[PDB]
């Protein structure tokens, strides 16, 4: 019997700072035990300072990104070139996903950008459109490896102030873009070591009020 779904592997990661947000993802694309491409990007600039990735089944991932990009285009046409805010983009994507509730897009979607107060924003979606704004989210094959590390290092979970008898928590604070990229790179190299579907390369898209910048780093190719 024909199976319309497939698994293209890879993993993605979104972190939000005070005045910026990053959306990272490895560039490896796979089926079963073969590598299809060592460089096939899956993090995209969708306009209006919104970056997006839909990781899992690449055909669905591409289709969704394609449709959202097109949604941004028509939002301009219909509402006098108004900028699509990240919260509005999130709600729109929910409807794109839930529209196929009974034949889902097999993807874990993350978008990143800035909210209307200029602060960093990351939204994450399940395959059928359930969404939530967070400081932090990993998605895809190695999400289970990376996410707990993010809880510890971004949100300072389980970390208490030394000598306070485990009574005073380590206080929450925004991270600099330099600190965030360090965590992203360490997250992906760690994931590369222990997950076979993660490697080859790492592409990070950084979003500030000035626009969308890119950074690329080699990952292990085994």
């Amino acid at each position: 019997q024909f199976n319309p779904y497939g698994d293209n592997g890879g993993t993605i990661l979104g972190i939000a700072g005070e005045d910026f947000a990053v959306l990272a993802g490895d560039t490896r694309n796979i089926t079963d035990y073969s590598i299809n491409s060592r460089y096939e990007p899956k993090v995209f600039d969708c306009g209006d300072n919104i970056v997006m990735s839909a990781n899992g089944f690449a055909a669905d991932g591409d289709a969704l990104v394609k449709r959202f990009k097109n949604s941004v285009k028509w939002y301009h046409f219909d509402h006098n070139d108004k900028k699509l805010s990240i919260n509005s983009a999130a709600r729109n994507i929910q409807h794109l996903l839930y529209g196929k509730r009974f034949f889902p897009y097999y993807v874990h979607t993350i978008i990143a950008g800035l909210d209307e107060d200029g602060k960093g924003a990351v939204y994450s979606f399940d395959p059928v459109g359930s969404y939530e704004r967070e400081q932090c989210r990993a998605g895809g094959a190695a999400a289970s490896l990376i996410m707990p590390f993010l809880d510890n290092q971004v949100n300072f979970k389980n970390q208490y102030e030394p000598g306070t008898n485990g009574k005073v928590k380590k206080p929450l604070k925004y991270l600099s873009v330099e600190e965030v990229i360090k965590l992203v790179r360490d997250s992906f190299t760690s994931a590369t070591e222990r997950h076979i579907q993660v490697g080859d390369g790492l592409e990070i898209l950084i979003v500030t009020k000035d626009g969308v910048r890119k950074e690329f780093y080699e990952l292990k190719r085994d």
Binding site: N158, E193, Q197
Partner: protein, 222 residues
Amino acid sequence: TTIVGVKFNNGVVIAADTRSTQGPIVADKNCAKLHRISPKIWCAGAGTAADTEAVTQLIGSNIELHSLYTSREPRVVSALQMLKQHLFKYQGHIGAYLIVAGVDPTGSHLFSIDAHGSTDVGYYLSLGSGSLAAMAVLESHWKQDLTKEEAIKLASDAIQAGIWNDLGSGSNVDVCVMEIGKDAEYLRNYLTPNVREEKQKSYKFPRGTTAVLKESIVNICD
């Protein structure tokens, strides 16, 4: 697993990668897939990890007793016969896919064994999930009348093909050279082309970060 075996002028060489997986997770980054059956008979193993270890140890044990009984150095065909009959008896349920090689009074030998009990003879062989990547290299570069150094190069190149192109294989290349008239030389981590890069950050915690409820001394003495 990727594993290979290559015959040359005055003996035989085998090689293997060092990745061990549990689904998509790398359980062991540097496991030993080259097994000693007797001093000059070695076995490369793919398949179920515990099976290749256990069946190689059992036959190795019985080969040692046989060698002592007969006052003779063990032959590769004896290990071949004992392994295949054991595996056939278990109708494939013992998932061991082996490349058996070595030197004995009869000469130098290279064989392969499938989990179900079939054996092959050849000048070059490859088994495991990366066997197609390896065999592609072997079919491209193998020739009659290889030297020792040529055969090592060909064998390790065939393993590398697996390391880079097969997600089931990774990390390092182990090699074992069995030459006639000489001691077998086991080359553990002959190549290490997958060294982890320096981490961006030290995650050493301030002492007292973890909240503690109780302390106590444990008694290990009598």
